Design a protein around this ligand. Structure first.
Ligand SMILES: *[C@@H]1O[C@H](CO)[C@@H](O[C@@H]2O[C@H](CO)[C@@H](O[C@@H]3O[C@H](CO)[C@@H](O)[C@H](O[C@H]4O[C@H](CO)[C@@H](O)[C@H](O)[C@@H]4O)[C@@H]3O)[C@H](O)[C@H]2NC(C)=O)[C@H](O)[C@H]1NC(C)=O
Ligand SMILES: *[C@@H]1O[C@H](CO)[C@@H](O[C@@H]2O[C@H](CO)[C@@H](O)[C@H](O)[C@H]2NC(C)=O)[C@H](O)[C@H]1NC(C)=O
Ligand SMILES: *[C@@H]1O[C@H](CO)[C@@H](O[C@@H]2O[C@H](CO)[C@@H](O)[C@H](O)[C@H]2NC(C)=O)[C@H](O)[C@H]1NC(C)=O
Ligand SMILES: *[C@@H]1O[C@H](CO)[C@@H](O[C@@H]2O[C@H](CO)[C@@H](O)[C@H](O)[C@H]2NC(C)=O)[C@H](O)[C@H]1NC(C)=O
Ligand SMILES: *[C@@H]1O[C@H](CO)[C@@H](O[C@@H]2O[C@H](CO)[C@@H](O)[C@H](O)[C@H]2NC(C)=O)[C@H](O)[C@H]1NC(C)=O
Ligand SMILES: *[C@@H]1O[C@H](CO)[C@@H](O)[C@H](O)[C@H]1NC(C)=O
Ligand SMILES: *[C@@H]1O[C@H](CO)[C@@H](O)[C@H](O)[C@H]1NC(C)=O
Ligand SMILES: *[C@@H]1O[C@H](CO)[C@@H](O)[C@H](O)[C@H]1NC(C)=O
Ligand SMILES: *[C@@H]1O[C@H](CO)[C@@H](O)[C@H](O)[C@H]1NC(C)=O
Ligand SMILES: *[C@@H]1O[C@H](CO)[C@@H](O)[C@H](O)[C@H]1NC(C)=O
Ligand SMILES: *[C@@H]1O[C@H](CO)[C@@H](O)[C@H](O)[C@H]1NC(C)=O
Ligand SMILES: *[C@@H]1O[C@H](CO)[C@@H](O)[C@H](O)[C@H]1NC(C)=O
Ligand SMILES: *[C@@H]1O[C@H](CO)[C@@H](O)[C@H](O)[C@H]1NC(C)=O
Ligand SMILES: *[C@@H]1O[C@H](CO)[C@@H](O)[C@H](O)[C@H]1NC(C)=O
Ligand SMILES: *[C@@H]1O[C@H](CO)[C@@H](O)[C@H](O)[C@H]1NC(C)=O
Ligand SMILES: *[C@@H]1O[C@H](CO)[C@@H](O)[C@H](O)[C@H]1NC(C)=O
Ligand SMILES: *[C@@H]1O[C@H](CO)[C@@H](O)[C@H](O)[C@H]1NC(C)=O
Ligand SMILES: *[C@@H]1O[C@H](CO)[C@@H](O)[C@H](O)[C@H]1NC(C)=O
Ligand SMILES: *[C@@H]1O[C@H](CO)[C@@H](O)[C@H](O)[C@H]1NC(C)=O
Ligand SMILES: *[C@@H]1O[C@H](CO)[C@@H](O)[C@H](O)[C@H]1NC(C)=O
Ligand SMILES: *[C@@H]1O[C@H](CO)[C@@H](O)[C@H](O)[C@H]1NC(C)=O
Ligand SMILES: *[C@@H]1O[C@H](CO)[C@@H](O)[C@H](O)[C@H]1NC(C)=O
Ligand SMILES: *[C@@H]1O[C@H](CO)[C@@H](O)[C@H](O)[C@H]1NC(C)=O
Ligand SMILES: *[C@@H]1O[C@H](CO)[C@@H](O)[C@H](O)[C@H]1NC(C)=O
Ligand SMILES: *[C@@H]1O[C@H](CO)[C@@H](O)[C@H](O)[C@H]1NC(C)=O
Ligand SMILES: *[C@@H]1O[C@H](CO)[C@@H](O)[C@H](O)[C@H]1NC(C)=O
Ligand SMILES: *[C@@H]1O[C@H](CO)[C@@H](O)[C@H](O)[C@H]1NC(C)=O
Ligand SMILES: *[C@@H]1O[C@H](CO)[C@@H](O)[C@H](O)[C@H]1NC(C)=O
Ligand SMILES: *[C@@H]1O[C@H](CO)[C@@H](O)[C@H](O)[C@H]1NC(C)=O
Ligand SMILES: *[C@@H]1O[C@H](CO)[C@@H](O)[C@H](O)[C@H]1NC(C)=O
Ligand SMILES: *[C@@H]1O[C@H](CO)[C@@H](O)[C@H](O)[C@H]1NC(C)=O
Ligand SMILES: *[C@@H]1O[C@H](CO)[C@@H](O)[C@H](O)[C@H]1NC(C)=O
Lengths: 124, 432, 121, 121, 121
């Protein structure tokens, strides 16, 4: 049993900023790469960002590439996602998930093993 | 898939040349690297390594290094060729105890002076063991005259067994086994890497091992093959036995010039009376110690076996007695008083002293040990034994020795030399 | 943390973070000669390894990812066993017999790469 | 122009154009031993510097731009003073006490870079 | 196929596929000294060539494509004659007198390249 719990504010003005976070437990945090996936209010899933297990390498979807920052702290078992600028198009549920990458010295994943329940963020 | 790694912690058994390091010596003088005041030791977790003290080439290197240093230290000293002459000898009879009757000879001879035109009549004292009667009942020659040239050790170079540290060259490492109750062979856990060995004192002796290291917990019996009576058994004590040796004779020294810039150091008259050299071993301590040794021998020979100790078998003086160098003089002590028991104040061991010494097992290179003035007193630790098994309900153990490698094997048993092999490959999941 | 060879009993993926620890430890006339021979040898051994990395295209690196595939016949194990259970001493024994094959393949793929890169310029 | 060490009294930015001048100058039995020791040492010193550049990721270069930030506490000066007024001898004295700190940081950033580059492949 | 120097009589373009063959072959006290001198020299010669490749920007390579143009005065021949008819021994004689000029140019273009690459970072 593992848990991923998203926290963070859910209501912002466009043009502002928002920081979300995700507390993990039940597994070695430091052994896994992690990512964020959005669920549009009425559509499907979209990948947004990915961070390596050691925190050194980050990747983004083009639509947030110059706006969002993904960060990790392995001593607290947490992820964070720092949003800036914010658009109406960014309204979504943001899910914390474990998987996405690999560490090249272990079997690859390229899929998401665990999901949290998601933080809801609305841009007004 | 193949990924190359360099700096991989892998090693193989290897033999290399180790160098000496150290903190007027015979051995390590200036041809020796100053030591590191804060040497390192690294414990290796989860490493099991096989050691074999009987195949350890560090022993062969130490044997060779000390012999070569010994010879280099005599090479520049005075040759005593002029001394191999006919001697006219009588007995030293002045205030002699019974134990010393016939031990000292008062010999006169015609010696070379600085000038080639002149000779001098001189005399000196020799021990009975240094001379041979020839023919004229007073005529003698030195013992080495029909065998070898003899040189005089330079009386400025001490024989003190100052400790030597062996250090590995780069690319190599010395592994140390810290497993207590390690018997010299097989695998052991608790292995650490060290830069250098601890200091090892090159103490030369037979039968009894002096001034060495002690076992951490129990007396240990180590042998190449415990059931092979042709092999020696090394015994390491977990406590020292103190031994006190002396030459209670106030000797004087005289210098006889034998040429332009050379002199012979002769024993002159002796002040006071004449007494036998001897060593004292505390009796109770010896008995307790011997107690522990037998308890451990029983583990290999049976606890219903009768273990007997006996004195040495015949052979030369260098083999049958306890030979050691202390105070600058060479003693040959009778250990039959220590090894005379079934199963298990002070014990006095009488000793003989020689001036003409043939080191190790060589023939052809003799040395003369200059006499030491005054009275000699030595205090040392017996830290172990060399035993040989004489062999159906009983076993007899006797003192052994004469092969110096056995005295270093007892200190170097914990060390192994390995070679570092930094490259390796392994599958990874990446592509150039 | 650990000093020289302190990672020897660690697994392959725990080790291989200490590569600089080991790399840096590789650097009377009779005594003079014995020591010069020891020093000259240490240099010669060092240079042979560096030359070898060079011809494989790994000069200047401690970790070099190559373009040669791994034959399953050399060691049919998954990354999990190799990097998480095994130590480097154990691994070295397991594939000792394939070392020369692997080295030959590494040299050859570099020769081909080096030439292709010339033709592209 | 200038030969070996001719730039020693020049400023740091005037010098550092002569790096190949200095780099190329680094290359009876008793006399034989004394000279072999001198030659062996010159080789060993050369190789230690090359090994060190290698672990910092600067192999094969005379000028190597790294990814370590400069702490103002090591030397609180502007580029104008360092490169236009100071000589290398003066600079070496000014930051002598920070040399080992800087070297440790250079080794560590290379270890991290080298691993990140493996994960990306 | 061929071993050491087996390509010596081959043409320049047939040879130059064997570069690793030759590169790998470059690695009583009186006898000890004579042999140490021979070994020390082999190391010193090896390192001078490696240092030289380094300052030209060719470290770690057997074939290094540079940014210096070829003056027709050094050898006015087409690629067909040089690579298909000539051997390396013949070529070495043909351009012996221009070796130092070429080496000076290689060092200088690397110094300029190395600095331009610093300014771009
Ligand atoms: C086992 O270890 C013990 C402990 O180290 C060792 O005994 C020691 O031996 C040395 C040397 O024999 C003793 O030191 C001597 O003490 C006398 C005392 O008057 C001094 O005169 C001696 O100096 C003379 O020799 C020097 C040589 O360089 C000259 O420079 C000097 O001018 C003098 O001529 C010397 O200091 C030391 O006291 C004993 N220690 C004890 C406790 O007796 C023992 O020998 C070791 N066992 C063996 C077999 O070696
Ligand atoms: C050893 O013999 C010598 C003689 O060769 C003894 O020396 C002589 O002793 C007498 C005693 O009255 C003196 O008068 C002589 O002058 C001594 N001779 C010399 C040359 O000095 C010597 O005492 C004997 N030594 C021992 C220990 O007996
Ligand atoms: C040197 O002389 C000694 C003394 O005579 C010789 O050794 C003796 O050899 C006989 C032979 O039967 C033995 O009985 C003696 O016991 C030996 N004496 C000693 C003191 O050992 C010795 O062999 C001679 N050496 C040479 C090379 O001729
Ligand atoms: C060592 O000392 C012992 C006694 O202290 C000597 O033993 C004597 O040896 C002779 C030889 O036949 C025997 O007849 C005596 O009975 C022995 N005495 C005892 C008490 O057993 C021994 O010879 C000495 N050894 C040496 C090498 O001198
Ligand atoms: C005999 O062994 C004892 C015990 O190992 C030695 O005494 C120790 O020497 C060390 C040296 O620093 C001291 O730290 C210990 O405290 C000593 N122990 C005792 C009980 O004093 C002793 O020196 C050895 N004797 C000789 C002659 O070496
Ligand atoms: C024995 O010692 C005494 C002590 O003075 C001395 O007078 C005597 O002459 C000595 N004996 C001999 C034979 O010298
Ligand atoms: C010397 O003492 C020994 C002791 O046995 C004796 O046999 C010998 O004859 C003595 N020599 C002289 C010259 O008195
Ligand atoms: C010394 O030489 C003389 C010469 O005749 C001789 O008579 C004398 O006995 C010799 N001395 C000794 C002690 O041999
Ligand atoms: C030492 O321990 C090993 C461990 O297997 C054993 O085989 C060997 O016989 C022991 N040595 C002796 C002398 O018993
Ligand atoms: C140990 O000695 C006995 C004595 O005969 C011999 O049979 C045995 O083979 C020896 N052990 C080894 C390992 O050689
Ligand atoms: C040995 O013990 C005897 C007993 O009287 C004593 O006289 C002698 O001095 C002791 N020897 C040593 C070296 O302590
Ligand atoms: C050796 O001498 C010391 C000096 O104090 C003494 O305490 C010790 O008991 C002596 N040992 C023997 C065996 O006499
Ligand atoms: C040595 O220990 C044995 C054990 O039985 C004892 O009988 C013997 O008397 C002891 N010897 C001494 C000198 O204490
Ligand atoms: C020796 O003591 C051990 C201790 O357990 C025991 O097992 C063994 O049978 C004993 N041997 C004899 C001969 O009594
Ligand atoms: C050992 O003791 C016996 C007892 O008779 C003796 O004959 C023998 O010579 C002694 N061994 C030595 C080397 O003294
Ligand atoms: C050996 O022990 C016996 C027991 O009485 C004793 O008489 C004999 O003298 C001892 N031997 C030695 C050399 O001390
Ligand atoms: C030896 O004799 C000399 C003569 O003066 C004396 O000074 C010295 O103290 C004596 N040595 C001993 C140990 O008695
Ligand atoms: C040794 O093995 C234990 C077993 O879990 C492991 O935890 C420890 O870290 C290992 N040692 C090293 C240096 O990793
Ligand atoms: C793998 O090795 C086997 C022999 O062990 C060989 O026949 C096979 O062709 C190799 N596979 C590849 C892809 O080279
Ligand atoms: C992969 O790892 C598992 C461990 O769970 C092992 O049982 C399996 O044999 C491995 N696969 C291969 C290629 O052997
Ligand atoms: C390999 O390491 C993993 C790490 O959790 C462990 O669970 C597994 O049992 C290990 N396998 C072996 C064969 O030691
Ligand atoms: C390597 O060769 C030896 C030769 O006997 C063989 O026993 C061993 O199994 C071989 N190793 C492998 C991995 O096949
Ligand atoms: C020496 O200092 C003067 C001062 O301006 C400067 O012009 C000159 O170029 C300096 N020397 C060198 C080698 O630059
Ligand atoms: C700069 O150095 C000081 C100590 O001199 C240290 O406390 C500080 O954290 C360093 N700054 C950085 C960015 O590392
Ligand atoms: C920058 O340079 C000027 C020289 O005009 C100097 O006065 C100033 O102190 C420098 N800044 C720092 C960081 O010291
Ligand atoms: C530093 O160099 C500039 C170059 O023009 C000069 O003006 C300035 O005075 C120099 N500063 C010092 C402190 O020498
Ligand atoms: C370097 O250490 C010495 C030690 O006394 C100190 O005086 C000096 O100022 C230090 N250098 C710097 C730049 O702080
Ligand atoms: C030697 O010359 C002949 C002439 O055609 C050529 O075919 C042959 O291959 C040459 N040798 C080598 C090693 O190429
Ligand atoms: C070619 O070399 C000649 C002299 O041999 C020289 O004058 C000419 O400028 C060189 N050409 C180039 C492009 O450097
Ligand atoms: C080019 O090659 C041809 C060979 O057909 C030769 O005749 C001609 O001279 C070459 N050109 C030059 C630059 O010499
Ligand atoms: C150069 O090689 C070509 C290859 O076909 C050959 O035809 C030509 O004749 C050769 N030229 C010379 C001068 O050897
Ligand atoms: C190289 O110099 C020598 C000197 O005599 C000359 O003969 C030769 O032709 C020169 N080589 C070239 C290619 O010009």
């Amino acid at each position: 049993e593992v848990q991923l719990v998203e926290t963070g504010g859910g209501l912002v003005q466009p043009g502002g900023s928002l920081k979300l976070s995700c507390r993990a437990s039940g597994y070695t945090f430091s052994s896994f790469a992690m990512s964020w996936v959005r669920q549009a209010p009425g559509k499907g899933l979209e990948w947004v960002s990915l961070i390596n297990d050691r925190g050194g390498l980050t990747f983004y979807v083009d639509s947030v590439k110059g706006r969002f920052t993904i960060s990790r702290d392995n001593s607290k078992n947490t992820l964070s996602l720092q949003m800036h600028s914010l658009r109406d198009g960014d309204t979504a549920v943001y899910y914390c998930a474990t998987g996405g990458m690999s560490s090249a010295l272990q079997s690859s994943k390229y899929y998401f093993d665990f999901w949290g329940q998601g933080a809801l963020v609305t841009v007004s | 898939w193949v990924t190359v790694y360099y700096g991989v912690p892998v090693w193989k058994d290897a033999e290399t040349t180790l160098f000496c390091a150290s903190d007027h010596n015979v051995w390590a003088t200036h041809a020796c690297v100053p030591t590191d005041p804060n040497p390192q030791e690294i414990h290796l977790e989860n490493v099991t390594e096989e050691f074999n003290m009987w195949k350890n080439n560090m022993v062969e290197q130490m044997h060779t290094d000390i012999i070569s240093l010994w010879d280099q230290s005599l090479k520049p000293c005075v040759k005593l060729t002029p001394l191999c002459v006919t001697l006219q000898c009588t007995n030293v009879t002045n205030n002699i105890t019974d134990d010393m009757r016939g031990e000292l000879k008062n010999c006169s001879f015609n010696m070379t002076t600085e000038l080639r035109d002149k000779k001098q009549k001189v005399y000196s004292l020799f021990y009975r063991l240094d001379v041979v009667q020839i023919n004229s009942n007073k005529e003698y020659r030195l013992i080495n005259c029909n065998t070898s040239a003899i040189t005089q050790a330079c009386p400025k170079v001490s024989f003190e067994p100052i400790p030597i540290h062996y250090c590995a060259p780069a690319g190599f490492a010395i592994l140390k086994c810290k497993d207590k109750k390690f018997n010299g062979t097989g695998p052991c856990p608790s292995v650490s890497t060290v830069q250098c060995t601890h200091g090892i004192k090159p103490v030369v002796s037979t039968q009894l091992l002096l001034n060495g290291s002690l076992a951490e917990e129990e007396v240990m019996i180590r042998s190449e093959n415990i059931t092979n009576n042709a092999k020696n058994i090394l015994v390491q004590f977990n406590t020292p036995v103190q031994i006190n040796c002396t030459r209670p004779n106030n000797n004087t020294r005289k210098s006889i010039r034998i040429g332009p810039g050379q002199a012979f150091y002769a024993t002159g008259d002796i002040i006071g009376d004449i007494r036998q050299a001897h060593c004292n071993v505390s009796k109770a301590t010896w008995n307790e110690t011997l107690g522990k040794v037998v308890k451990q021998l029983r583990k290999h020979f049976g606890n219903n076996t009768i273990i007997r100790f006996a004195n040495s078998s015949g052979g030369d003086l260098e083999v049958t007695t306890h030979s050691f160098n202390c105070g600058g003089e060479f003693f040959y002590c009778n250990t039959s008083g220590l090894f005379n028991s079934t199963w298990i104040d002070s014990i006095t061991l009488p000793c003989r002293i020689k001036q003409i010494i043939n080191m190790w097992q060589r023939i052809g290179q003799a040395m003369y040990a200059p006499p030491i003035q005054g009275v000699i007193r030595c205090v040392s630790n017996i830290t172990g034994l060399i035993l040989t098994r004489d062999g159906s309900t009983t076993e007899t153990f006797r003192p052994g020795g004469g092969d110096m490698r056995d005295n270093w094997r007892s200190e170097l048993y914990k060390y192994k030399v390995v070679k570092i092999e930094p490259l390796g490959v392994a599958p990874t999941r990446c592509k150039r | 943390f650990l000093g020289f060879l302190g990672a020897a009993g660690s697994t392959m993926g725990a080790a291989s973070m200490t590569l600089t620890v080991q790399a840096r430890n590789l650097l009377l006339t009779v005594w003079g000669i014995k020591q010069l021979q020891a020093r000259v040898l240490a240099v010669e051994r060092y240079l042979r390894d560096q030359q070898l990395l060079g011809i494989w295209g790994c000069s200047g690196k401690l970790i070099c990812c190559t373009n040669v595939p791994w034959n399953s016949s050399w060691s049919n194990r998954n990354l999990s066993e190799i990097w998480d259970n095994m130590t480097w001493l154990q691994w070295d024994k397991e594939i000792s017999n394939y070392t020369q094959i692997i080295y030959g393949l590494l040299e050859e793929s570099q020769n081909q790469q080096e030439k292709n890169e010339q033709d592209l310029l």
